[PDB]
Design a protein around this ligand. Structure first.
Ligand SMILES: CCCCCCCCCCCCCCCCCC(=O)OC[C@H](COP(=O)([O-])OCC(O)COP(=O)([O-])OC[C@@H](COC(=O)CCCCCCCCCCCCCCCCC)OC(=O)CCCCCCCCCCCCCCCCC)OC(=O)CCCCCCCCCCCCCCCCC
Ligand SMILES: CCCCCCCCCCCCCCCCCC(=O)OC[C@H](COP(=O)(O)OCCN)OC(=O)CCCCCCCCCCCCCCCCC
Ligand SMILES: CCCCCCCCCCCCCCCCCC(=O)OC[C@H](COP(=O)(O)OCCN)OC(=O)CCCCCCCCCCCCCCCCC
Ligand SMILES: CCCCCCCCCCCCCCCCCC(=O)OC[C@H](COP(=O)(O)OCCN)OC(=O)CCCCCCCCCCCCCCCCC
Ligand SMILES: Nc1nc2c(ncn2[C@H]2C[C@H](O)[C@@H](COP(=O)(O)OP(=O)(O)OP(=O)(O)O)O2)c(=O)[nH]1
Ligand SMILES: [Mg+2]
Lengths: 48, 320, 82, 53, 98, 63, 345
């Protein structure tokens, strides 16, 4: 116990950490799926 | 959860958490006349938070580790040096006055935040409303100059009307020879080097100027030492004291909320104390400011925001 | 219990706001309850403020009547029996 | 612990390798006239498929 | 109708020129503003009635309501000026120059 | 690598830049012509919609 | 203000320009303009001081006169064409009065005399609200009628807007007045590019908004009203001077900052439409704008002005004030120039 007042960021905001990590993971997975779907759609449309 | 508009919506109403003893009480008096003991006893037997006199190291004690910092970080002004030589050419007197007013403003903001957050009353010793007494005493003694007086008055006009006046002002009237005798009996060798002209200037500033401006807007409780030196009649008067004047009656929940935000953000509190008015008494050059600010930054626990300093044991820095 | 007591002593001390709020609620709910609500729109539709322009028929439509005194068409017997 | 202490010494060589890689990518991108310049229009050797990579 | 519409447009122009040439009375300035508002109402109403535009006769009602709320706001501002300065003189409103 | 690689890379770069030059000149001409006489996709300024016109028979026969 | 009227006032402030942009009717764009004006007036008179009352009164009378001129133009168009939209053959007098009144609403010169004074005397967040949000709706009305406007009148209004804005921002010291004449110069640039390419007008508007937001956030961090007040920022918040310098150089239009891109593409399109003299004069006045920006940079970042004694206590205290989207807007307003083909359309 160093600071005389309890810091706001003394403990990590676990809800914020979980929401941010899950959001980043979700956008990464959705990005990979949409990129693969766009590649497949482009190849199907152009006959490649 | 940090206090804010969302907390006010979900319910953090100051008027809901108020009670009878939720009062701002300020004890005032001359240099050495029973001011500390009476405030402590009043707060103890009224269940109120006692705030002693905000010294030079008030910000040092209330921020960080709470140990007193070096003098060059805490104002670079010495009360002992002022007592030894009040007319020094380096402007120690006005630097001490401005630093003590800033400390008193921070203490008043802390007390107001505590009262608005917990509902507990506060008993301050010599708040911001009775520091112009010391200002005018040094001006009438020739210790400071008219430019310093104008700058202090400008800062007081900038910061003072944003807060609420105390509910009660208990004053200790005391003769200058009695103050001199008590100062001699205390034994501080720097403190015996004070002049009866300065003490009379303090007492005259009190009687002529401080008591009336408290008088038309809050409850004034002048007592002698013998009316004092027994903290039961004063508390009885506080009990049988009616608050039917001042701006405290006109305050409602949202005014309390905005005042709570103002006193909970310390940067807005000390915003106008650092106005760019370049008096040579308080102006600090770029090189000295650079060195002082840098050394305060490698002071332990002050390099980063609180909770992010790994040298003092803060954990989960990478995760937050 | 407490809610019933609150409306009860509200009605005791001041009935103006109670009557106004009850009239407000009744004005909301009664068009959703009464069976005559559609009949106002039917009457407003049936009221002939404009000339009914005759149509040139090719004989492929038998629902339109050739004569006003015909059984065919939107009669207002419901309006007469209303 | 040597890799932990001297990890700063690989950033500039990594940038050099990355710059060589990007030069190679630009070089294979600008192949619209490979073995098509009239100064260097020659028949391909049987042991090779491109004049330059 | 063209002569009366020309008269209405000249009335609007005169009210606009009066608004642009200030006198000591912000009340008089607001009155010139409603001279413009009233001229706008008559031109809109006469145009709608001449064109038989029953779909657009609500437009005068909307301009009246919106301009009336705007003038209520302006009257509140003039009340604030009269309270802080004693009077509504526009030359008292000049300390934002520097 | 050799001089032929740089030679043919320069040829490809010059071809790309010349094609970009003629494409930019043509799009200047296209935009100028279309703005002067809007008849293609670009510079199609709006026009009130015919779908909001009443076509039902009305009270006045002379419409 | 209690949260009920705070929500109502902010919702109407939001709703005004939204109705103006979403609306295909001249009447509805008008009513959105006075939703914006009426809803924002209590926010100017929120502080309840004589300067705020002065700013609110001047702002009200200016917007009321301009709104009445707009309604005059709408009514005259309604008589002449029988519709509620300047379609193709409305009168040039009507269109010029519309442009006149929208320029009066925007505060560009020679109708610029109220904007520095209205920006002064109000809090910094209301200066940000004004100088960013209150201009999208008049720009929306201007963009909807781009092929009908008068290029001569627009070019005169634009070049004098940049002239007066550059000279004012050169003149004063106050941060709010500096930002107001900066706004006048930038609206001059947007107005000049309006008749030829409204897409570049929108691009310049977004670049100016994402440059104006972190200026105003940085000012609100310490309520620095003055050049001296932002000059002692090194003692208060030293971790911002680099971004202050970068964003002020971006506001000046210096490459490789992304604020060079609006001026560059505007000059390019103007030269596509052959107004070389106008483009040269605009760029020289932009150099004047960059001059007062560079003086501000010299005051706040590259030199170190003398400080006070209570700044030690202010450094003793902590702060959680600066919000998360300050850095995002700062980075997007500094280092976006290689994405110029993506930014333009
Ligand atoms: C590297 C360059 C970019 C750095 C950006 C970050 C800047 C920063 O935060 O610096 C602080 C931080 C250093 O701080 P520190 O020393 O640790 O402690 C902070 C102090 O205690 C803080 O102490 P203080 O705040 O109390 O006092 C300091 C304060 C005191 O204030 C002052 O001293 C004021 C100074 C005023 C004068 C300067 C004004 C600004 C000038 C900027 C340059 C302009 C000209 C350049 C050209 C035009 C640019 C548009 O500020 C400063 O001294 C300046 C702070 C900023 C310095 C860094 C500036 C970087 C940008 C400019 C250079 C790079 C871009 C341009 C060149 C590009 C190439 C041509 O910088 C870094 O850590 C740099 C990054 C290093 C790691 C990089 C890792 C890369 C990993 C890549 C893989 C993972 C990502 C994959 C992404 C893609 C996935 C698909
Ligand atoms: C072009 C640019 C496009 C993208 C712009 C927006 C970039 C992301 C902005 C959001 C973000 O970074 O959120 C991070 C924030 C971290 O939360 P934290 O700092 O712990 O605050 C809690 C304090 N009690 O997390 C949160 O605020 C909550 C978690 C994320 C919610 C979404
Ligand atoms: C047209 C633009 C010029 C109009 C000039 C009108 C007369 C004038 O100069 O009035 C000045 C006056 C200034 O306001 P005031 O508060 O009276 O100031 C005290 C004077 N130092 O201004 C006022 O009091 C406001 C006057 C508004 C007048 C509105 C109606 C004007 C009708 C006449 C139009 C011009 C006719 C010119 C004829 C020339 C000869 C043929
Ligand atoms: C397309 C156009 C989109 C709109 C562009 C114009 C936006 C103008 C700014 C609107 C909001 C301003 C505002 O509410 O200011 C007050 C607030 C004060 O900041 P603070 O009290 O710290 O609250 C932040 C809490 N984290 O300040 C803020 O919250 C600042 C918000 C700035 C948002 C800028 C968005 C730019 C466009 C993306
Ligand atoms: N110059 C100056 N001196 C001050 C100021 N505030 C307090 N002091 C001095 C007066 C005393 O010598 C010393 C301690 O303050 P006190 O008034 O509390 O004195 P002390 O604790 O000795 O007596 P007490 O029983 O509390 O009244 O600080 C101020 O604003 N200016
Ligand atoms: Mg004491």
């Amino acid at each position: 116990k160093f600071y005389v007042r309890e810091p706001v960021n003394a403990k990590p905001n676990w809800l914020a950490v979980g929401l941010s990590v899950g959001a980043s993971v979700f956008m990464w997975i959705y990005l990979i799926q949409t990129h693969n779907e766009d590649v497949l759609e482009y190849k199907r449309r152009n006959g490649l | 959860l940090r206090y804010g508009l969302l907390a006010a919506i979900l319910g953090d109403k100051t008027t809901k958490k108020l009670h009878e003893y939720s009062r701002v009480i300020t004890v005032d008096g001359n240099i050495c006349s029973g001011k500390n003991k009476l405030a402590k006893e009043i707060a103890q037997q009224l269940g109120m938070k006692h705030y002693p006199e905000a010294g030079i190291q008030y910000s040092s004690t209330t921020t960080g580790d709470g140990r007193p910092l070096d003098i060059e970080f805490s104002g670079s002004c010495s009360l002992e040096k002022f007592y030894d030589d009040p007319k020094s050419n380096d402007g120690n007197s006005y630097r001490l006055q401005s630093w003590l007013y800033a400390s008193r403003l921070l203490q008043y903001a802390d007390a107001l935040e505590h009262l608005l957050s917990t509902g507990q009353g506060v008993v301050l010793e010599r708040s911001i409303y009775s520091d112009f007494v010391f200002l005018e005493a040094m001006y009438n003694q020739g210790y400071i100059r008219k430019q310093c007086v104008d700058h202090y008055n400008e800062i007081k006009r900038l910061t003072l009307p944003e807060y609420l006046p105390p509910h009660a002002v208990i004053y200790i009237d005391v003769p200058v020879p009695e103050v001199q005798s008590r100062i001699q009996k205390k034994g501080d060798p720097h403190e015996m080097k004070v002049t009866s002209a300065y003490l009379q200037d303090i007492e005259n500033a009190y009687k002529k100027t401080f008591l009336p401006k408290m008088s038309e807007m809050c409850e004034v409780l002048v007592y002698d030492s013998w009316e004092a030196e027994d903290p039961t009649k004063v508390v009885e008067d506080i009990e049988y004291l009616k608050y039917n004047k001042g701006p405290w009656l006109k305050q409602d929940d949202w005014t309390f909320h905005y005042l709570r935000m103002l006193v909970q953000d310390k940067t807005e509190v000390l915003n106008y104390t650092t106005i760019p008015v370049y008096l040579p008494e308080i102006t600090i050059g770029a090189h000295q400011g650079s060195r002082i600010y840098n050394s305060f930054r490698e002071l332990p626990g002050r390099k980063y925001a609180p909770g992010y300093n790994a040298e003092v044991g803060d954990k989960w820095i990478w995760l937050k | 219990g407490r809610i019933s007591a609150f409306l009860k002593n509200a009605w005791a001390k001041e009935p103006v706001l109670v009557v106004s709020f009850s009239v407000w609620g009744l004005a909301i709910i009664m068009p959703m309850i009464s069976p005559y609500t559609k009949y106002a729109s039917m009457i407003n539709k049936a009221t002939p403020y404009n000339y009914p322009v005759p149509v040139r028929d090719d004989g492929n439509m038998p629902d339109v009547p050739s004569h006003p005194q015909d059984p065919l068409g939107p009669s207002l017997d419901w309006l007469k029996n209303l | 612990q040597l890799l932990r202490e001297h990890w700063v010494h690989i950033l500039v060589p990594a940038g050099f390798v990355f710059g060589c890689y990007l030069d190679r990518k630009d070089d294979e991108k600008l192949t619209a006239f490979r073995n098509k310049s009239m100064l260097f229009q020659r028949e391909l050797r049987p042991n090779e498929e491109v004049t330059w990579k | 109708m063209p002569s009366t519409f020309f008269n209405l447009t000249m009335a609007f122009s005169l009210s606009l020129l009066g608004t642009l040439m200030f006198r000591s009375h912000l009340m008089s300035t607001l009155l010139c503003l409603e001279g413009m508002v009233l001229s706008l109402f008559i031109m809109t109403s006469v145009t709608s009635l001449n064109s038989n535009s029953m779909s657009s006769m609500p437009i005068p009602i909307t301009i009246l309501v919106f301009a009336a709320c705007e003038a209520a706001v302006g009257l509140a501002l003039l009340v604030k000026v009269s309270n802080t300065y004693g009077t509504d003189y526009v030359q008292n409103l000049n300390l934002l120059q520097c | 690598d050799g001089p032929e690689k740089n030679y043919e890379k320069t040829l490809a770069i010059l071809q790309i830049e010349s094609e970009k030059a003629e494409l930019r000149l043509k799009e200047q001409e296209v935009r100028r012509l279309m703005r002067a006489r809007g008849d293609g996709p670009w510079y199609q300024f709006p026009t009130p919609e015919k779908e909001f016109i009443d076509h039902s028979p009305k009270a006045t026969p002379d419409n | 203000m209690n949260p009920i009227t705070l929500a109502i006032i902010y919702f109407t402030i939001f709703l005004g320009p939204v109705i103006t942009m979403s609306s295909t009717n001249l009447m509805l764009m008008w009513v959105g303009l006075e939703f914006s004006l009426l809803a924002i007036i209590p926010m100017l008179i929120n502080k309840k001081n004589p300067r705020s009352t002065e700013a609110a009164t001047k702002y009200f009378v200016t917007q009321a006169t301009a709104s009445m001129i707009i309604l005059l133009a709408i009514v005259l168009n309604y008589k002449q064409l029988g519709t509620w939209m300047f379609q193709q053959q409305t009168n040039g007098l009507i269109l010029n009065m519309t442009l006149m009144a929208l320029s009066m609403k925007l505060g560009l010169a020679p109708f610029h005399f109220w904007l520095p004074e209205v920006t002064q005397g109000i809090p910094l967040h209301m200066g940000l609200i004004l100088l960013t949000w209150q201009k999208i709706a008049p720009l929306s009305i201007l963009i909807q009628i781009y092929p009908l406007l008068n290029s001569t009148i627009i070019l005169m209004l634009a070049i004098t807007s940049i002239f007066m804005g550059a000279w004012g921002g050169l003149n004063q010291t106050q941060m709010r007045k500096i930002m107001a004449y900066s706004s006048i110069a930038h609206m001059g640039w947007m107005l000049a590019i309006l008749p030829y390419n409204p897409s570049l007008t929108l691009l310049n508007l977004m670049i100016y908004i994402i440059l104006t937001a972190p200026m105003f956030m940085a000012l609100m961090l310490n309520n620095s009203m003055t050049i001296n007040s932002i000059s002692l920022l090194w003692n208060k918040t030293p971790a911002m001077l680099t971004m202050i310098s970068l964003m002020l150089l971006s506001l000046g239009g210096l490459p490789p900052l992304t604020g060079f891109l609006p001026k560059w593409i505007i000059i390019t399109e103007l030269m596509k439409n052959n107004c070389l003299i106008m483009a040269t004069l605009m760029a020289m006045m932009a150099l004047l704008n960059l001059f007062f920006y560079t003086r501000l940079i010299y005051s706040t970042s590259l030199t170190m002005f003398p400080t006070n004694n209570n700044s030690k206590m202010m450094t003793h205290q902590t702060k959680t004030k600066p919000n998360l989207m300050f850095s995002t807007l700062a980075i997007m307003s500094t280092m976006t120039l290689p994405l110029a083909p993506q930014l333009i359309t």
